[PDB]
């Protein structure tokens, strides 16, 4: 779990952590010209209020 979104992982739900690679420089909002990264904390949430037992 990332140190930024560590409070989201406290809940007992389905979640994952998938890193990514992005560009750098001042063209997208970065102070350094080196290629930056990306921290995404994706967690699942229910939709339908009814379930099925197969």
């Amino acid at each position: 779990t990332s140190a930024e979104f560590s409070f989201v992982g406290e809940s007992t739900t389905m979640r994952e952590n998938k890193c990514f690679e992005q560009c750098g420089g001042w063209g997208c909002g970065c102070f350094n010209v080196n290629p930056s990264c990306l921290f995404v904390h994706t967690y699942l949430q229910s939709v339908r209020k009814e379930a099925l037992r197969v």
Partner: peptide, 12 residues
Amino acid sequence: ALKKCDGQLSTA
């Protein structure tokens, strides 16, 4: 300094 680099670059 051979040539300038004001566009896209990556220094280290």
